[PDB]
Design a protein around this nucleic acid. Structure first.
Ligand SMILES: [Mg+2]
Ligand SMILES: [Mg+2]
Ligand SMILES: [Mg+2]
Ligand SMILES: [Mg+2]
Ligand SMILES: [Mg+2]
Ligand SMILES: [Mg+2]
Ligand SMILES: [Mg+2]
Ligand SMILES: [Mg+2]
Ligand SMILES: [Mg+2]
Ligand SMILES: [Mg+2]
Ligand SMILES: [Mg+2]
Ligand SMILES: [Mg+2]
Ligand SMILES: [Mg+2]
Length: 125
RNA sequence: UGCUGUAAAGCUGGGUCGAACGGCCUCUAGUGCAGAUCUUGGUGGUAGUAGCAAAUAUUCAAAUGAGAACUUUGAAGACUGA
């Protein structure tokens, strides 16, 4: 890791917690919703049903919010936004906003390279 | 295209697009949908399916026309049967 050293990153659950029967019906979106029904096999945690979000899956407080490269990602919309990452170049990486123009994005990439700030999305437009 | 969060979700690559829009500190509410034989609109399977079967009955040729079972004319065969 080129960032500040961290313990090995553990993700207790790496899949997406998908709402029950978001596979059965198009009207039911995958966005997680807690079953509230009286008879629900999922709400009652029958064997073979889907896993559900709970605080036990919470991330280690030392590796939380770190991308696979070991950085915390900060959203940048202009070159002045990189000033808050001057003393945090080994723990914070910059991510250029999608709505920044192709002109201003070149300036942000140019200044980040000068400051040593890492950019998580360095190519797009 | 991926990243972050236990999660609600947030951010991002590519495509499309054409005029507005967001972060944060607060304020406010007509603020979150899978159901209500919910409302309005739209779309399926059914399915090229049920079916298009009462009232006797049509046929040959020519003309017209891009095209004629169905139009026009002629010839015939019928019917309504005052
Ligand atoms: Mg019960
Ligand atoms: Mg784009
Ligand atoms: Mg756009
Ligand atoms: Mg316009
Ligand atoms: Mg504002
Ligand atoms: Mg309401
Ligand atoms: Mg609905
Ligand atoms: Mg309806
Ligand atoms: Mg239908
Ligand atoms: Mg039929
Ligand atoms: Mg019938
Ligand atoms: Mg005739
Ligand atoms: Mg007679």
């Amino acid at each position: 890791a080129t960032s500040v050293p961290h313990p090995k990153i553990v993700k207790k659950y790496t899949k997406k917690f998908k709402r029950h029967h978001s596979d059965r019906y198009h009207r039911v979106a995958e966005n997680w919703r807690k079953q509230k029904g009286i008879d629900s096999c999922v709400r009652r945690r029958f064997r073979g049903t889907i896993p559900q979000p709970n605080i036990g899956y919470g991330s280690n407080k030392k590796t939380k919010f770190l991308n696979p490269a070991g950085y915390k990602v900060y959203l940048v919309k202009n070159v002045k936004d990189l000033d808050v990452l001057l003393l945090h170049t080994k723990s914070y990486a910059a991510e250029i906003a999608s709505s920044v123009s192709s002109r201003k994005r070149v300036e942000i990439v140019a200044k980040a390279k000068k400051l040593g700030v890492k950019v998580t999305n360095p190519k797009g437009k």
